[PDB]
TrEMBL record, chain B:
The lineage of its organism: Bacteria, Bacillati, Actinomycetota, Actinomycetes, Mycobacteriales. This is Multifunctional fusion protein. In the N-terminal section; belongs to the ATPase B chain family. In the C-terminal section; belongs to the ATPase delta chain family. It is found in: Cell membrane. F-type ATPases have 2 components, F(1) - the catalytic core - and F(0) - the membrane proton channel. F(1) has five subunits: alpha(3), beta(3), gamma(1), delta(1), epsilon(1). F(0) has three main subunits: a(1), b(2) and c(10-14). The alpha and beta chains form an alternating ring which encloses part of the gamma chain. F(1) is attached to F(0) by a central stalk formed by the gamma and epsilon chains, while a peripheral stalk is formed by the delta and b chains. Residues 1-47 form a coiled coil. This protein is part of the stalk that links CF(0) to CF(1). It either transmits conformational changes from CF(0) to CF(1) or is implicated in proton conduction. F(1)F(0) ATP synthase produces ATP from ADP in the presence of a proton or sodium gradient. F-type ATPases consist of two structural domains, F(1) containing the extramembraneous catalytic core and F(0) containing the membrane proton channel, linked together by a central stalk and a peripheral stalk. During catalysis, ATP synthesis in the catalytic domain of F(1) is coupled via a rotary mechanism of the central stalk subunits to proton translocation.
TrEMBL record, chain F:
Belongs to the ATPase B chain family. The keyword Nucleus does not apply. The keyword Membrane applies. The chain holds residues 58 to 114 of 171 of the full protein. Keywords: ATP synthesis, Cell membrane, CF(0), Coiled coil, Hydrogen ion transport, Hydrolase, Ion transport, Membrane, Transmembrane, Transmembrane helix, Transport. It comes from Mycobacterium tuberculosis. One of its GO terms (molecular function) is hydrolase activity. This is ATP synthase subunit b. GO terms for cellular component: plasma membrane; proton-transporting ATP synthase complex. It is found in: Cell membrane. F(1)F(0) ATP synthase produces ATP from ADP in the presence of a proton or sodium gradient. F-type ATPases consist of two structural domains, F(1) containing the extramembraneous catalytic core and F(0) containing the membrane proton channel, linked together by a central stalk and a peripheral stalk. During catalysis, ATP synthesis in the catalytic domain of F(1) is coupled via a rotary mechanism of the central stalk subunits to proton translocation. Component of the F(0) channel, it forms part of the peripheral stalk, linking F(1) to F(0). F-type ATPases have 2 components, F(1) - the catalytic core - and F(0) - the membrane proton channel. F(1) has five subunits: alpha(3), beta(3), gamma(1), delta(1), epsilon(1). F(0) has three main subunits: a(1), b(2) and c(10-14). The alpha and beta chains form an alternating ring which encloses part of the gamma chain. F(1) is attached to F(0) by a central stalk formed by the gamma and epsilon chains, while a peripheral stalk is formed by the delta and b chains. The gene is atpF.
Length: 241, 50, 121, 41, 221, 57, 50, 118, 121, 100
């Protein structure tokens, strides 16, 4: 006796859990649709600002701080993008694995990782390991706005230009094909000047008001912010998947 | 603005008239309900007398 | 005799609402055990807090139990009980901790034990 | 209580772990680039 | 013991017209322990009878009274034991309640649901509130027809869930006082013709514009 | 000055006219809901004293 | 029976057997007593068919 | 005619055909007609873009954080924020222009230019 | 006895394809119910249509229904059923309305019922 | 009364393995000296409520100050009641420990 009672109790408990998880899966599907919509909505501004930055760099002085690498690299500010809620799978664990790979790459080159986190799961993971989190941002993992990305990018670029970091990385989950949620590490600063080709031959001359260097240095942090925002959106869609 | 003001006063007076027409049926059904209750009174008394 | 014709409409309604809240809490306990208080609705979290406070306020320091806790017992009139539990059901004490509802008498003991914890009814 | 506080006066209670993770492959750390069209490789 | 109960319950019968046409309807009562309908005597009597009304303690504590589990309750006679008005207003009730039970997990995700699914959720909440009834207060069949018409026709989609009981009560009171023709000819004709349904809709609309919800709002669509 | 005051008065007239237009339905609903809550005040006091007399008898 | 749940979902006919099954204090006696009370108008009609 | 594409960080604000696009870059006011040399510029903090079509009436969009790009394709305006003329309430647009925060005051002034004032 | 050695290879393959399609439709039915058919993929919607067609073609006009309707019942051979469901699994009838499949016999009845709603093979 | 010992609590390191929630003494404080009766007044109810809260707050993201204080005090009280085998304590030292 009393064994059948506990068995029926566990049965109804597991039934409640099953109902809740099925509802959560269908809700996550609907919200994946929403997040993909937001991503493909933010795509065009990214394309156009990339094209304008290329046009400006064509005739500019490519010696901006965000554009030249520094001898004596002592510190790289890493921004880890995790989630706030926890009913995802190995999402946060994959982010943390990629971030540890990045930290052990940065210690191989003599740089000291400075850690910025987005999400409460990264807060937990890094406070448990007695890490030093310079700044944390929470509450916008499932629907990030451009203002959150602007704040994050401004803080990161202020730390870069200055108690100062020589590189800037982002560890986030790239979302591709609705089937590939892959944790990736990107280097956002300093950018690398890559020359593709003259492409078009002799063409019309572009006018710049007031000149190309002013607009280039005004667009560079805007481009950093656009990339941070795209990373946030990709990580949100990946978290929902 | 003239039309809007006259339409406002027209709708206001019709609203008050409709308020009156409604509280009319209100008090009528109220007295009817009271009557039904007083009617139940005598039968609930006789059901115990018997 | 837990019937509106015997105990009254307010007694019966407060008892029914207490029972409904406790039943919903019992239904949610398994999810809270496995998935946590975070995956519940705002209404469900409100109900869970109210239900914990209700199930603690149903306890009482009894006269015959002073030999087990050292604390003397308490008598609560039925009107005070009904009014206190109506307030708990409406949510007038959702800011008082879960303790200060535990092994007390009426609303005066509730106020005293809440302020001994740093709270105000 | 006085004794307990005088004793707590002299009582003595008892960094990041290594995680032994191997370095990321530098080929897999993507780098944001500025695609300039000038010929100067 | 199966013979003990089946010998008794097979004497409840509907006699043929040659034997007079009388009938004996049996309502046996079985108490289960811990909702164990697979016990010996419960199994026997479930096997013998023509239908079962299952009553749960959990449903009782949630406010569902009578605490009938409409999902598992069953009558093998079915629509052959209903008048045509009840057979017509209650045909869309069982599927509605099953849909509501399936969708109950998505209560706090209405914005994440199809519009049809949120409609089914609200309709099911209204229908669950409609099947509640006080103790010792049975309703004649014409009033049950009017109530289930209120439910399944859509005239409760604008009333708050916490006001459905009061709305149905006051509407039945109004119709008992004012519009006795609808109830009278439902009782006489055993059906709800299209003109009776039209007059019923008119009365419902007038009452709605007269009715006052508990949240101060209006129940007018 | 007169013509600018005229165009300003016309703008204000349109705005106030639309505002009074909305206030029409606003106060109509306000009055009729006051009326129906007064009506619902009755039919319960009647039920109240009906219950009182039924029980005292 | 006069209960909307039964009359709408699990209708009982004259000559049928509808088990009422439940744990305890679930309302079985209440259902059956309401069914008995619902025949008051049938009895008042005086018609042996009703 | 020229093709206007005003896009924001997360949405396409407007897209259509025009005969004249007036705005104000950090070097001064500018007006673009159908054919116009390629140009890249940065709009002012409290920028207002006025678009003129053949039959319709002038659109008037307050732009916050904009960059103008004239090409052979047409005009393309990048924005962080944008608000059309018939979506601004001049009360908040006026008491925000008086603020002490620079960028929010600039946003208020842009909305004020768009509603018609200043 | 739904075994390739009892009924044959083609019977087994057709039955297993039908069962696979119906199981996939069963899996998608809840996504359709809670979210909507508009949310599904393109192959998802195509399979949903084909599976509704197979569902309705599994129906039949029974000989127990000649008492009410008046039209006799069908006796479809095994070969005709295998061929009809093979074609239905291929998709040769995804343009025919759903109602053309309710309560019919073999493929001749299907054609004569389809052309009554304005649809050819 | 009964002292219910559990192997799950024993393995966890709680030794003696008394399950405080289901263990009880029907004599109560009459079986204690006044010092022990006054320092260990509601210790069993406190530990029962602590075990309840620890089970309820197993996956709680954030907890208010009162619940966290209860959890800390209860963990310390649980660690305080552990004891080795064949290592008794006089009643005055037990009073001092419960006073701690
Ligand atoms: N429809 C109802 N609405 C409100 N209360 C009800 C309803 N039905 C029953 N009750 C209440 O439930 C209580 C128990 O019901 P009841 O006695 O009819 O159950 P029972 O099946 O006879 O259980 P037992 O035989 O063990 O007493 C009663 O006090 C009654 O007031
Ligand atoms: Mg009974």
């Amino acid at each position: 006796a009393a064994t059948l009672r506990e068995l029926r109790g566990r049965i109804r408990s597991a039934g409640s859990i099953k109902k809740i998880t099925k509802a959560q899966e269908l809700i996550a599907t609907s919200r994946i649709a929403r997040a993909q919509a937001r991503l493909e909505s933010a795509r065009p501004y990214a394309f156009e600002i990339t094209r304008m930055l290329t046009t400006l760099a064509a005739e500019a002085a490519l010696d901006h701080p965000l554009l030249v690498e520094r001898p004596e690299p002592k510190r790289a500010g890493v921004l880890v993008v995790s989630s706030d809620r926890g009913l995802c799978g190995a999402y946060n664990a994959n982010i943390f694995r990629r971030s540890e790979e990045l930290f052990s790459l940065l210690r191989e080159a003599g740089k000291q990782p400075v850690l910025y986190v987005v999400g409460r799961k990264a807060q937990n993971y890094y406070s448990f390991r007695n890490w030093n989190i310079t700044e944390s941002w929470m509450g916008f993992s499932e629907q990030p706005t451009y203002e959150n990305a602007a704040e994050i990018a401004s803080t990161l670029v202020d730390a870069f230009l200055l108690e100062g970091v020589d590189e800037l990385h982002i560890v986030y989950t790239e979302f591709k094909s609705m089937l590939s949620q892959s944790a990736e590490a990107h280097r956002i600063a300093p950018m690398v000047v890559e020359y593709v080709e003259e492409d078009i031959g002799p063409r019309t001359l572009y006018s710049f008001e007031p000149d190309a260097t002013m607009l280039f240095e005004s667009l560079l942090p805007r481009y950093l912010t656009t990339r941070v925002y795209a990373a946030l959106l990709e990580s949100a869609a990946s978290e929902l998947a | 603005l003239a039309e809007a003001s006259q339409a406002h006063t027209k709708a206001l007076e019709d609203a008050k008239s409709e308020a009156h027409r409604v509280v009319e049926e209100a008090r009528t059904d109220a007295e009817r309900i009271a009557e039904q209750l007083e009617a139940q009174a005598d039968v609930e008394a006789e059901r115990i007398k018997m | 005799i837990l019937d509106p014709s015997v105990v009254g409409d307010e007694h019966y309604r407060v008892a029914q609402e207490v029972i409904r809240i406790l039943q919903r809490y019992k239904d949610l306990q398994d999810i809270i055990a496995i998935l946590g208080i975070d995956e519940l609705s705002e209404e469900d979290k409100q109900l869970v807090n109210r239900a914990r406070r209700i199930e603690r306020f149903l306890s009482q320091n009894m006269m015959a139990a002073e030999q087990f806790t050292g604390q003397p017992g308490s008598t609560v009139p039925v009107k005070e009980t009904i009014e206190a539990f109506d307030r708990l059901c409406k949510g007038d004490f959702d800011h008082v901790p879960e303790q200060a509802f535990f092994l007390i008498g009426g609303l005066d003991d509730l106020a005293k034990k809440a302020e001994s914890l740093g709270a105000k009814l | 209580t006085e004794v307990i506080k005088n004793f707590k006066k002299g009582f003595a209670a008892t960094v990041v772990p290594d995680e032994h993770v191997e370095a990321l492959d530098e080929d897999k750390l993507a780098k944001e680039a500025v695609k300039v069209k000038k010929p100067a490789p | 013991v199966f013979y003990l109960h089946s010998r008794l319950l097979e004497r409840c019968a509907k006699l043929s017209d040659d034997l007079g046409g009388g009938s004996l309807t049996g309502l046996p009562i079985i108490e289960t322990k811990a909702n164990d309908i697979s016990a010996y005597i419960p199994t026997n009597v479930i096997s013998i009878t023509d239908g079962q009304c299952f009553l749960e303690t959990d449903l009782f504590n949630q406010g569902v009274r009578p605490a009938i589990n409409v999902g598992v309750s069953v009558s093998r006679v079915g629509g052959a034991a209903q008048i045509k008005a009840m057979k017509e207003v209650a045909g869309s009730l069982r599927l509605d309640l099953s849909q509501y039970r399936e969708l109950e997990a998505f209560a706090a995700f209405a914005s994440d649901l199809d519009a049809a699914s949120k409609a089914q959720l609200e309709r099911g909440a209204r229908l669950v509130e409609l099947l509640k009834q006080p103790q010792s207060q049975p309703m004649p069949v014409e009033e049950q027809v009017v109530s289930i018409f209120l439910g399944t026709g859509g005239h409760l989609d604008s009333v708050p869930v916490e006001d459905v009981r009061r709305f149905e009560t006051e509407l039945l009171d109004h119709m008992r006082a004012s519009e006795e023709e609808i109830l009278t000819e439902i009782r006489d004709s055993q059906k709800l013709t299209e003109e009776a349904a039209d007059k019923l809709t008119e009365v419902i609309k007038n009452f709605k514009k007269g009715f006052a919800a508990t949240g101060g709002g209006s129940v007018v669509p | 000055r007169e013509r600018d005051a005229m165009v300003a008065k016309t703008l204000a007239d349109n705005k106030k006219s639309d505002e009074q237009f909305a206030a029409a339905q606003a106060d109509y609903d306000e009055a009729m809901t006051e009326a129906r809550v007064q009506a619902s005040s009755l039919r319960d006091n009647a039920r109240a004293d009906g219950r009182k007399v039924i029980e005292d008898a | 029976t006069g209960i909307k749940a039964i009359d709408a979902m699990t209708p009982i006919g004259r000559g049928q057997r509808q088990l009422i099954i439940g744990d305890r204090k679930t309302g079985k006696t209440a259902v059956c007593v309401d069914t008995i009370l619902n025949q008051r108008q049938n009895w008042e009609s005086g018609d042996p068919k009703k | 005619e020229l093709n206007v594409e005003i896009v924001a960080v997360d949405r396409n604000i407007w897209s259509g055909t025009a005969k004249f696009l007036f705005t104000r870059t950090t070097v001064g006011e500018i007006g673009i007609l159908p054919r116009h040399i390629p140009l890249v510029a940065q709009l002012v903090d409290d920028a207002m873009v006025r678009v003129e079509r053949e039959g319709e009436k002038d659109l008037r969009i307050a732009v916050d954080g904009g960059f103008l790009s004239v090409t052979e394709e047409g005009v393309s305006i990048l924005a962080e924020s944008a608000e059309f003329e018939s979506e601004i309430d001049e009360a908040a647009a006026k008491q925000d222009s008086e603020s002490d925060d620079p960028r929010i005051a600039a946003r208020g002034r842009a909305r004020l230019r768009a509603v018609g004032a200043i």
